[PDB]
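Predict the assembly for these two chains.
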Amino acid sequence: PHSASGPPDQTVTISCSGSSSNIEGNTVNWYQQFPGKAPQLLIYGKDQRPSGVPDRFSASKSGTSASLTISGLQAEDEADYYCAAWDDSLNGWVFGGGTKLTVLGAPTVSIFPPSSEQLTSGGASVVCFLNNFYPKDINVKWKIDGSERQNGVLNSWTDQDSKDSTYSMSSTLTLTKDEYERHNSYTCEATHKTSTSPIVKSFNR
Amino acid sequence: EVQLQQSGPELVKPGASVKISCKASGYTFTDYYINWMKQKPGQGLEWIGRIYPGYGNTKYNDKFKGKATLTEDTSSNTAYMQLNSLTSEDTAVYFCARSLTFFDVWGAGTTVTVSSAKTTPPSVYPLAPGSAAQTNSMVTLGCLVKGYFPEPVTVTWNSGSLSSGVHTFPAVLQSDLYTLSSSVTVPSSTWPSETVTCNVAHPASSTKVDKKIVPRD
């Protein structure tokens, strides 16, 4: 698939199909690209495991259909799996799309006022922590004197953490020094499935 | 041990040229066929070029044929990729690989940004708590890295000693300037007890700044 949300201990399977037979020569490999790392080959020649790769991984298939199976998923398995052929098998070498993984998602839960240092530059950024939450889906709203603000908000999510399998988000609201000083209350409001009512953090000048 | 280390990336204007190098160590470099693989922002892996230790020297992706040259210096254990007539489509992380069938070893990768926008150093602002409600147990500190170009910046806390409980958020682009933030959660007895600092490196502008987190008055 283009996804894959599996709980630890459960099995996972990834399928790969090629438009032309590639059983000849080599050459079908599987790569794993953990967050913030370079791709790493796990299987080559369809079913041969690379050194270090756990027994949990098994590759099979023939001709045009390939499958990568993980008998028991562990936290360290998260990332992006790619299917690939040999550059000298069919030329040129090509890779499969995205290991089934694509998403969203970017705040902060803990709120910060602009630093004095920034105010001097004639700018004002309010920053708003939303750390260690799951699922990734979450909605953050900014209110300035009770009024919702859409303009000038930058959101940004971290990849799933391999240590606790949670996500964290950062939300920044940037205003001019002049506009920041014409208002009193600044609120960061988070809507997440874990709470019936949105979680609110704010401060008043 | 085996290692590949790339260098030579950065900002380049459309039509301009760049030369990436890869430095190999921990294996007989002359023995292996080496490649460059690229990955455009938020996209997939794409083979670029190969050089085999034969009599000849190379294969290229069609789109880069005539613009890119892949070469090696076996005496210096280095692989090279010469990039001319760079297009916006060329922006991506370039990885050096030492395949055996099969890319078994990858470099960390180096980001190449093809853009007209100017290099702009980041303004780094220390984010100290503005409330006393969050005291004791765990205190969260922030670093705001604002108005830089191009990517990337590196953010560490206390030169790397502070690794756990760190969330460094992916940068957002706005008017050819990136902004990111990083939070760190430490025991309240660590801060402001001992110094906490964020270390920001923006090699594109050779910017290297440290911002100690000092409590507000």
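Chain A touches chain B through 51 residues (CB under 8 Å). The radius of gyration of chain A is 23 Å.
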